[PDB]
Amino acid sequence: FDRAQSTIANVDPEIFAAIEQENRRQEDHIELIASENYTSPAVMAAQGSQLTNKYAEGYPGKRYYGGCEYVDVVEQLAIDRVKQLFGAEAANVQPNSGSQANQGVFFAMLKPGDTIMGMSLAHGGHLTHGSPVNMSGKWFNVVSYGLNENEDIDYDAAEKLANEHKPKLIVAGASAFALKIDFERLAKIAKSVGAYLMVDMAHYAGLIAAGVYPNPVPHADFVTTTTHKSLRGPRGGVILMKAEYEKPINSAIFPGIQGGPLMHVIAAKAVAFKEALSPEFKEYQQKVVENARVLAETLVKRGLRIVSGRTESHVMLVDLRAKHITGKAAEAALGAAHITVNKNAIPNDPEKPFVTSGIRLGSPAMTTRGFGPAEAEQVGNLIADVLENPEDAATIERVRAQVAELTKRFPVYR
Amino acid sequence: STIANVDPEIFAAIEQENRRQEDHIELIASENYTSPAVMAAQGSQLTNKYAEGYPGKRYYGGCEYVDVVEQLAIDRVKQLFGAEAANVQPNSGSQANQGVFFAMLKPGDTIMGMSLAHGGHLTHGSPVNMSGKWFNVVSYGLNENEDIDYDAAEKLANEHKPKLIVAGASAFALKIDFERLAKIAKSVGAYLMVDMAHYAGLIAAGVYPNPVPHADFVTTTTHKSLRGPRGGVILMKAEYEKPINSAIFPGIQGGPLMHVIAAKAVAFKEALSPEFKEYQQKVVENARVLAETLVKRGLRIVSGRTESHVMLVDLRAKHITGKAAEAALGAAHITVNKNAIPNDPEKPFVTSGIRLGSPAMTTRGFGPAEAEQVGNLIADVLENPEDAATIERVRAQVAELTKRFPVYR
Numbered sequence: 001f002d003r004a005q006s007t008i009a010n011v012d013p014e015i016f017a018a019i020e021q022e023n024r025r026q027e028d029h030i031e032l033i034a035s036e037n038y039t040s041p042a043v044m045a046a047q048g049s050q051l052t053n054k055y056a057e058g059y060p061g062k063r064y065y066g067g068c069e070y071v072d073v074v075e076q077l078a079i080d081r082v083k084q085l086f087g088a089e090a091a092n093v094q095p096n097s098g099s100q101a102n103q104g105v106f107f108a109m110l111k112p113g114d115t116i117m118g119m120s121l122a123h124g125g126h127l128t129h130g131s132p133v134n135m136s137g138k139w140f141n142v143v144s145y146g147l148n149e150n151e152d153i154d155y156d157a158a159e160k161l162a163n164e165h166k167p168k169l170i171v172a173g174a175s176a177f178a179l180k181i182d183f184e185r186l187a188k189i190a191k192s193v194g195a196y197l198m199v200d201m202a203h204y205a206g207l208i209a210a211g212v213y214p215n216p217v218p219h220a221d222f223v224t225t226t227t228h229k230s231l232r233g234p235r236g237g238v239i240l241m242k243a244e245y246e247k248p249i250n251s252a253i254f255p256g257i258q259g260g261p262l263m264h265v266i267a268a269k270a271v272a273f274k275e276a277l278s279p280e281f282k283e284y285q286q287k288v289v290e291n292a293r294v295l296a297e298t299l300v301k302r303g304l305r306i307v308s309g310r311t312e313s314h315v316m317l318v319d320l321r322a323k324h325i326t327g328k329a330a331e332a333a334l335g336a337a338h339i340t341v342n343k344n345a346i347p348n349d350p351e352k353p354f355v356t357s358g359i360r361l362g363s364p365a366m367t368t369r370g371f372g373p374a375e376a377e378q379v380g381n382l383i384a385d386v387l388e389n390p391e392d393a394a395t396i397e398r399v400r401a402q403v404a405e406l407t408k409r410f411p412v413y414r
Numbered sequence: 415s416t417i418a419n420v421d422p423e424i425f426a427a428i429e430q431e432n433r434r435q436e437d438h439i440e441l442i443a444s445e446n447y448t449s450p451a452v453m454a455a456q457g458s459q460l461t462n463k464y465a466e467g468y469p470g471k472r473y474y475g476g477c478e479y480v481d482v483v484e485q486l487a488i489d490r491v492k493q494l495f496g497a498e499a500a501n502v503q504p505n506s507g508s509q510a511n512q513g514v515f516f517a518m519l520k521p522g523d524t525i526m527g528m529s530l531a532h533g534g535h536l537t538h539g540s541p542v543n544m545s546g547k548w549f550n551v552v553s554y555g556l557n558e559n560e561d562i563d564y565d566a567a568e569k570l571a572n573e574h575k576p577k578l579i580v581a582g583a584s585a586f587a588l589k590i591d592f593e594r595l596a597k598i599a600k601s602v603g604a605y606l607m608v609d610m611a612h613y614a615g616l617i618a619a620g621v622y623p624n625p626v627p628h629a630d631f632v633t634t635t636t637h638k639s640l641r642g643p644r645g646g647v648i649l650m651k652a653e654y655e656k657p658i659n660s661a662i663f664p665g666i667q668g669g670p671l672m673h674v675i676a677a678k679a680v681a682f683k684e685a686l687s688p689e690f691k692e693y694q695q696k697v698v699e700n701a702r703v704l705a706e707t708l709v710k711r712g713l714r715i716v717s718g719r720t721e722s723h724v725m726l727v728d729l730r731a732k733h734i735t736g737k738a739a740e741a742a743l744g745a746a747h748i749t750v751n752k753n754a755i756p757n758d759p760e761k762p763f764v765t766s767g768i769r770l771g772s773p774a775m776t777t778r779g780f781g782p783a784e785a786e787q788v789g790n791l792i793a794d795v796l797e798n799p800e801d802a803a804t805i806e807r808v809r810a811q812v813a814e815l816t817k818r819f820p821v822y823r
């Protein structure tokens with residue numbers, strides 16, 4: 001237990017080597033997975049702290065164990081800051097993940113077998129929004145809604161579904177949707193059938209905090225989110241709720257579905273929220289939206305199609321059919337050229353779910369490492385180059401060579 | 415980008431918590447001090463990676479190096495406990511338990527677990543926990559001798575026919591007869607799940623009976639006596655590998671915390687060393703000596719002895735409640751927690767006992783002599799909890815101990 005002797009290299013050479021290779025992989029690859037980001041050294045330092053040694057069951061000033069004076073300060077700062085970030089009436093910063101945040105809401109307000117509404121997985125919804133192989137879909141009755149012919153959210157069909165099936169709770173938000181979501185319209189739909197509105201803003205949370213994407217907080221009963229992704233924090237979850245749901249939400253997280261919170265991660269959440277309150281963060285998110293638009297614009301110029309026809313956020317879904325390539329094949333080829341994306345089903349995808357006709361692209365990560373409009377356009381063209389000739393070794397080589405020039409010029413961690 | 419520069423408030427709070435861990439003798443049985451190497455791992459850049467799925471079977475590309483990490487964690491924890499399969503992704507012990515429930519049960523099914531009043535955990539069927547709110551819970555407890563009442567448990571099993579039986583505890587000092595519990599479960603066609611969270615480190619070192627050969631599922635925290643990062647693990651027989659893995663993902667979790675899994679692997683590496691078995695031998699020794707010392711001073715140990723890291727102290731002969739004992743001891747910089755004893759005459763928030771554990775103090779270097787001194791220091795406070803002179807004298811001696819035995823050097 002000497003900090004000079006107990007280093008990863010000294011204790012575990014294998015793990016040391018793996019972490020080192022992952023550090024270099026993060027430098028040497030252009031990351032375009034929309035859910036990924038690079039969190040600050042300050043954030044990482046916090047969850048590498050001795051706060052992992054503390055059991056702090058309960059809430060600030062209301063713990064089961066003693067000695068929680070300082071972790072109470074930590075958690076309350078996290079609570080106050082995330083409340084300030086989104087203008088929420090109350091908050092819970094203990095969810096271990098985005099999944100647990102969502103489950104926390106379900107446990108608080110629902111009973112197994114209740115009917116819920118959520119965006120279909122096939123049209124950009126998340127697993128925890130009602131997938132039959134997820135708890136949300138196996139232990140509850142799920143009625144899903146999707147997009148219309150214009151590839152915008154079909155609010156009319158959702159309203160008809162709400163009146164027909166009378167859900168106890170409506171889930172909104174997405175893992176792969178490029179446009180602004182009309183939270184006010186959804187709140188009216190939910191109120192019209194006496195349902196709760198839960199918005200999962202995990203992907204947009206950073207953009208919302210900077211005010212470059214609509215805030216669901218004034219409209220929703222509950223707002224759940226991850227602290228990683230566009231919020232650029234540590235890996236974990238947060239529940240935002242109206243004051244009237246403070247008691248059941250806090251009780252649901254503990255002792256409902258969790259035990260001792262990860263106080264070291266909560267500290268990291270607090271550091272991330274502090275960063276998110278700065279003017280620099282708003283400037284970062286403005287560049288996130290700009291880079292995403294430029295990336296989508298460039299792909300359209302090269303003959304690709306964007307689902308919904310445009311992006312109004314950090315993310316886009318690219319229809320690949322014009323280049324006669326599957327999402328799976330595109331993901332692999334792009335990967336060989338050191339560009340990380342992920343395959344993703346498009347609306348009415350003619351391919352199998354594990355094959356798909358599209359790729360999901362996001363700008364938060366590349367924006368964090370300093371990419372601007374010019375680089376975003378270059379990346380778009382590099383992507384198209386691979387898509388038009390995915391198995392040509394010479395093409396992959398040329399692109400990988402240019403990617404190397406970008407990553408050397410824009411290092412992630414200095 | 416340091417915490418001090420970026421977030422002065424959080425930095426100061428962390429520094430204060432560092433000092434608090436040094437300046438207090440920690441006897442909360444679930445607490446420990448994990449190594450700098452472990453902390454460094456979950457402070458790594460692996461927090462930047464989404465790795466939904468399992469090694470070699472991810473949704474996303476670029477998982478080559480986190481795959482090496484997770485598989486090292488899986489292989490090492492399999493080796494530590496002789497398990498046929500393992501899942502190292504649970505975010506906590508609670509999620510580890512929920513993973514098993516989601517895999518094998520449907521809402522409304524009947525389960526058996528140790529009662530909370532007799533040392534069981536929240537996730538073993540508490541009505542305000544998921545385990546107890548969405549399932550029908552039949553609890554079993556201790557007999558008159560304050561050992562597990564296996565006869566009553568077998569009768570309850572035959573009567574209520576649970577689909578699953580949970581064993582393990584948060585506050586039980588004796589060796590649990592896992593083989594007996596397995597026979598019971600098999601007789602009624604029930605699964606046996608053992609939650610070994612408190613004993614996992616002792617079990618890895620072979621100083622406490624291993625439930626793995628006898629149970630269908632063994633869940634645990636990676637913190638506590640195993641001395642790793644905060645998180646959970648499921649160990650399971652090979653025939654249940656698929657439903658368990660599927661239940662963790664995409665069942666109840668999403669992206670695993672790869673930085674914490676790396677920290678788990680480092681902790682498992684440490685637990686495989688000869689130094690760890692020697693550590694756990696000292697853990698058992700110090701707990702026994704602590705219990706022995708308290709008995710000489712007139713206190714009583716629930717179950718009459720300890721065979722592990724933990725003990726539940728009956729405080730009634732000293733005419734002090736667990737609540738008062740915890741408060742007075744805390745003032746003297748000795749951290750314990752109140753705990754109800756079997757047939758406790760006091761209200762649940764008052765109790766007639768305190769739970770004590772040796773893992774934390776053993777980790778910072780306490781031996782048999784220090785364990786005995788701590789026992790006497792505790793008894794001094796218990797016998798005069800409101801005496802200012804007694805609290806100060808004990809605090810001064812505690813200060814002498816924490817200075818000679820620093821947690822982090």
Ligand SMILES: Cc1ncc(COP(=O)(O)O)c(CNCC(=O)O)c1O
Pocket residue numbers: 034035097098099100126128173174175200201202203226236464667668669670
């Ligand atoms: C919208 C949304 N909500 C929750 C999650 C998962 O949270 P986790 O911390 O992984 O339990 C996600 C995750 N999706 C990953 C991705 O889109 O790549 C999500 O999108």
Ligand SMILES: Cc1ncc(COP(=O)(O)O)c(CNCC(=O)O)c1O
Pocket residue numbers: 055258259260443444506507508509535537582583584609610611612635645646
């Ligand atoms: C036996 C047992 N099982 C699960 C847990 C909690 O896991 P967590 O990571 O907190 O969700 C515990 C926890 N107990 C606290 C204590 O005993 O002090 C446990 O003992």
